[model samples]
Target: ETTALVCDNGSGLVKAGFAGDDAPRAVFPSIVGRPRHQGVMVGMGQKDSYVGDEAQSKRGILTLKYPIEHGIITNWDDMEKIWHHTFYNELRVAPEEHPTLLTEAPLNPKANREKMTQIMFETFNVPAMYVAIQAVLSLYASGRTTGIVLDSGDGVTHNVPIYEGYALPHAIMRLDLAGRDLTDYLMKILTERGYSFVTTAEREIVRDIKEKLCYVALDFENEMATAASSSSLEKSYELPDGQVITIGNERFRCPETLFQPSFIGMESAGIHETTYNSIMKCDIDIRKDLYANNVMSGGTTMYPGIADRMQKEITALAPSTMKIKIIAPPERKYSVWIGGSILASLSTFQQMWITKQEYDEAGPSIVHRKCF
Candidate 1:
């Protein structure tokens, strides 16, 4: 029940605070959109012709867009009204003062970051807010104070080093590949199978199928053999559109893509190699830090065998004397939110926050502060 401010793009900046036996409770998209009609709708900045997945048949339509590119809210066509309702419907701000936690992507663009600060501080008027990265936040929730963070989700693969809750900018790395790439790749497979799949709905359905049914196989050939001949089998899930997909004893395959991109039809090196590149980008003196602790995080890490595979793959690339350990989150996909919530509850967490007065005084310079 970790809550986060997510986006259609897949990556979510989590602001989870307040915890106990239950999961964190609130979340919102870093995005905003409006309907394609010409009049006031149920809510301002919402839609006059509101529609969603199953509402197509009813003539109601909901058109959603990523107003914020890569988690920085931009494209403010009707944001004022849109956010007004969002605050009401989503945050339910009751005119009472409360601390707030916010999430931002890894190495977010400076311009966008400045703009986001202004909006949250001036527009939304949050009483107090703190910003933190999703990956590092997840690592904190997992209880590790120092480790490398590997985030594979939606549109990119991000690797960053965290030292006692603070990230090292020099060691950050981002690649233009993630869950969306996997979905598109799978769509190619679907096309070869004679299914003309080309809709956000279809893509999302396939993604669900992948998550529920696919896994990382340590040994591709052996797993394939077991999948082909095992008598033991797991149940298959029926897609919302009536397609039945089975996991069987296949050992879940696509997740192996992190170690072997060739398995997914890509010519590039796998996550291990990319992670090495990130380490190389860091100073030689800090290299030991990278090897000693590699924090595995994100929705992709939730795939059953991802951590084991990462350990195995990274171990092969390193010297035998070096040890590789992949950390796991209680609920992999929601770890960031839980971590954010945990961080928020800390009495000293305010040190990571940039006050509204500070933001106004410094405005654009806020990007260089590295507050988180």
Candidate 2:
């Protein structure tokens, strides 16, 4: 019964394949770096497969150009289509039996949206379509008719309100901060810590530390206190090279920006801003229901302490009496796909898809209308 797919893409990672499914068909970097001249080189220590973070390791052959930027598509070429194909090939999706669902940032430029729509309908020749399935799928998954969807991603924070799982466009909200911005902030911290990351060697060290130690603390004072105390020694982990680093754990700290963006100095908004701001755009009574069912889904949600911090912060921002339930997707990272899979499996979702007639005759506008 599952016939359609849900995909999340950007300048860096391209996540595609059916929603509600076990895994993506394929995965690839939006960026492609080839040999300096031409031809695919294959062997041990091969440079042929250099792209994504792996490309950062191999210095010869080619340099990288990110195809997606800040959760938006930067290069409007075969890169998007190529990445999509890579994902589908990984998933082993058959072109004929399946429809397609794609997740784009809310309010993506009309032209960019158009280009992506063209790729799905024209290049891939997908017979049916749904755009921004998360808005609707999140609602269906929560079994709620009205609520908010806050997606904290690598490039931007997107908020959209759902009435019966249908998006209320006027209530959509976006922020300039995300995972990459946090990395940049941590990079600056390292610079101040005397890690000169201008050269390749320095950049690697900064990236390693950031990945291995950087974390967002929900309670900055408490975290700093904990790190300052003797207990930090118990929490510290030695790097392969024997350098010691501290956070709550060896891998990550509680990324606080989800709740407090002010720490990074980019904006004064917090994660609650989306919940409050999206609701404030509606009647107070409706706002209450929106608060009643709040769900968190996305890669950033995987960061340590996100769900609890969101619950705590949003609780203080809402009425003490308000009933708030912030639940993580069963598979936080693959919720989009799983959500899509569930939808595609149901007969009811058939009504949500763009029919063959619509996809063939309607053109890109249908992407905005039917999908959005």
Candidate 3:
């Protein structure tokens, strides 16, 4: 058989490629835009809707829609169109020719999984398919199995414990903050300084500042005081309008909210504490492994010193004798996709796919039986 196709359907982006490749073949925003008027479809053929930037560039002429949100698919109709685009236009392969390995989020509804299975087989007719949990794939990418994944996507942050290759559902935890929240927080801070910027310019401007300047501060109080005066932490960035501004304390002060959500006036615990608490809920024996292999996943998790920050707090919360470690995989930017690529390519993983025969025999219920 030929190589399998790997697709990770993230809320922010969609990454797809053939197995065994070092990276994805195509990566695009998880957005779809359709022309406001339906007449364009019949005139321009049935595929008039645009995906990714094609739709984004013509925002005024089209209606933008996201196929997935919170890492879950709400718009399956648009979703098939995405895969249809990915298969023919993106990957340049037919669906019936390749085995597809899809990545999904945790706490995904059973009904939706069944719906996905039905759609892939009946609609696109991929020869075989497997649905992988995003957190588990990230852990696999990091080369560790028994650990907790601290993922901070644009919409939500999830802390999940994985033992070996399995994800522990009971110990899962969620927080309302992540990249979007951090961007807003930073914008608010900059606005107080007379720099108001959220739509396209506001969105891009704030994200640029956060991505380029923000970092996790090891010693919050020390860093705060140090940033107050002239320090190395302060950096100057150019706004979209060609104006330059200096941001010092705001840099570390903004990301510090991840470590201490209370700074944002939220009662929920910081990500590190949430990680420790989730690990505590796991079986006592694997708790050490969870602490030792704290895998960081997602784009926001890329902040400098994030691993060091998590290691410091987790060690403090655990037994003094216990050893602790944190892993920041080079593929953290698309860890889930890279891991799925690795998983689908393995010789041992070939038989794991729910083939068309399996689906034909048991119908959609077969996914719940085989994939989980």
Query: How do the residues 26-97 of candidate 3 rate in per-residue lDDT, one tens digit apiece?
Result: 887667877665463345354568887566555555666677766667898888878887888888988889
Clashing pairs in 3: none
- lDDT against the true structure, per candidate, is 0.59, 0.62, 0.81
Candidate 2's residue-wise lDDT over 82-150, tens digit each? 444554444667655677776667766777777777776667777776765444455555555677877
Ordered list by lDDT, greatest first? 3, 2, 1
Error of 3 at 186 (Å): 2.8
Total clashing pairs for each candidate: 7, 18, 0
| TM-score, one value per model | 0.77, 0.80, 0.86
State in Å the error of residue 199, model 2.
6.8
lDDT of candidate 1 over 96-158, digit per residue (tens): 244455666676776755665566677667544555676777676678777778877664678
Question: Which order, best to worst by TM-score?
Answer: 3, 2, 1
How displaced is residue 242 in candidate 2, in Å? 7.5
Best by TM-score: 3
Evaluated with lDDT, which candidate comes out highest? 3
Q: How many angstroms is residue 242 displaced in model 1 relative to the true structure, after the best TM-score fit? A: 3.7
